[PDB]
């Protein structure tokens, strides 16, 4: 299929970056689109084959190359705030009847300065007796707060394995300071199990939030810990 790396990325204005895209389906055509709220998907650049690159609808500020059929990298010369969005690479066979296959996307955020990047703090809240007795169900809540930018992945884990059933995570994070050009965020999620499951002391629950921040080759002289890409979690045991 089509793969893209990185999946998330934060950049300081002026920095350069190369988004990778590969497809192993022998597709001749590869392309890059950006998706922005209320603007759908806009074609940046595309390629009909090795050695050829074709200008798209919004090529300014971007460069691409096609030395091979498999890869089609997108390079941001000098990152600018307007380049903040989600980029999708897509490929397909040559004829007009073929549909395009999309990669998973890359969420990119450009900031004036990185001093605004913060990882999340995570906390797990346990089910109340009231709910258990009243519904015979048990709901755990997870909170991730104070993070910025909005590049996170929250997952629940039970006895060593990731779960999806009985879970719903806010589709959007909320600003802790609605009035701030770079307000930090909070996000919640819930995990609901049967009262019986939670009441089993041997069951262990865990909420982990994968935060995408700075990398090793990133300077940092602030007192506070460098906000690198990391996983912050909180856990709780079942209660009898």
């Amino acid at each position: 299929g089509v793969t893209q790396t990185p999946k998330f990325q934060v950049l300081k204005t002026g920095q350069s970056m190369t988004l990778q895209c590969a497809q192993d389906m022998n597709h001749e055509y590869m392309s890059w689109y950006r998706q922005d709220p209320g603007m759908g998907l806009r074609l940046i650049h595309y390629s009909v084959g090795a050695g050829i690159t074709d200008q798209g609808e919004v090529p300014n500020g971007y460069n691409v190359s096609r030395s091979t059929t498999e890869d089609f990298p997108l390079r941001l010369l000098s990152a600018a705030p307007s380049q903040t969005s989600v980029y999708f690479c897509a490929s397909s066979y040559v004829s007009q009847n073929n549909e395009q296959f999309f990669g998973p996307g890359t969420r990119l955020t450009v900031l004036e300065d990185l001093k605004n990047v913060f990882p999340p703090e995570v906390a797990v809240f346990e089910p109340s007796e009231a709910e258990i007795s009243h519904t015979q169900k048990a709901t755990l809540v997870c909170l991730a707060t104070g993070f910025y930018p909005d590049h996170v992945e929250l997952s629940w884990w039970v006895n060593g394995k990731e779960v999806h059933s009985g879970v719903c995570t806010d589709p959007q994070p909320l600003k802790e300071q609605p009035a701030l050009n770079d307000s930090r965020y909070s996000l919640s999620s819930r995990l609901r199990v049967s009262a019986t499951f939670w009441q089993n002391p041997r069951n262990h629950f865990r909420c982990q939030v994968q935060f995408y921040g700075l990398s090793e080759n990133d300077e940092w002289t602030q007192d506070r810990a460098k906000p690198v890409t990391q996983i912050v979690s909180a856990e709780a045991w079942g209660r009898a």
Partner: protein, 201 residues
């Protein structure tokens, strides 16, 4: 060479038919496509119309009818699932264009409202698993007739509703979370407009 999705948001009740509109403007014969994008994912191909049968079938039970006279290619599905909640994009390629990449519309968000057959609204309080002090308020089990409003107090945070599906029980339920570093659950969702029969243990 363009496509238009006249509506931005579309709401359908769980189990009911769904329709996502799209119209095209093309010089030659149009090749139309529909894609779905689930939260935080890339676009996934559903179906396409090239030639012949105007009624085309695609992935996940979706269908679409190419209507020339109306220059439309609406996306349809007999019975909507909550999991069908996503963003939908129709795209087009003009046969007389010359092998250009697909051209997309602005998309339309589809919301499939869960059918809560056994509402039992209630606001519970949950304690932190590592320390006393911290707590959150959980407004859960309300039917989808309920609207969770943001908090007036700047120190109170309230998340929008969110439906969870316990497949092992074919059970689904809504819930919203509220917390504050200031505050009590009794008046947490006060500003909303909560069911008169809400259980406040």
């Amino acid at each position: 060479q363009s496509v238009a999705q006249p509506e931005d948001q579309v709401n359908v009740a769980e189990g009911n038919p769904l329709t996502v509109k799209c119209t095209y403007s093309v010089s030659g014969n149009p090749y139309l496509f529909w894609y779905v994008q689930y939260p935080n994912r890339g676009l996934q191909f559903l179906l396409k119309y090239i030639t012949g049968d105007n009624l085309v079938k695609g992935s996940y039970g979706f269908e679409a009818e190419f209507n020339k006279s109306q220059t439309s290619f609406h996306l349809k599905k007999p019975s909507a699932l909550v999991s069908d909640s996503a963003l939908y994009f129709c795209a087009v390629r003009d046969m007389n264009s010359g092998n250009t990449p697909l051209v997309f519309g602005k998309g339309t968000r589809l919301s499939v409202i869960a059918n809560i057959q056994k509402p039992d609204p209630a606001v519970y309080q949950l304690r932190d698993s590592k320390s006393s002090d911290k707590s959150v308020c959980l407004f859960t089990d309300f039917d989808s007739q309920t609207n969770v409003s943001q908090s007036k107090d700047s120190d109170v945070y309230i998340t929008d509703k969110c439906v969870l599906d316990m497949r092992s029980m074919d059970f689904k339920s809504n819930s919203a979370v509220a917390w504050s570093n200031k505050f009590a659950c009794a008046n947490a969702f006060n500003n909303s407009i909560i069911p008169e029969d809400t259980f406040f243990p």
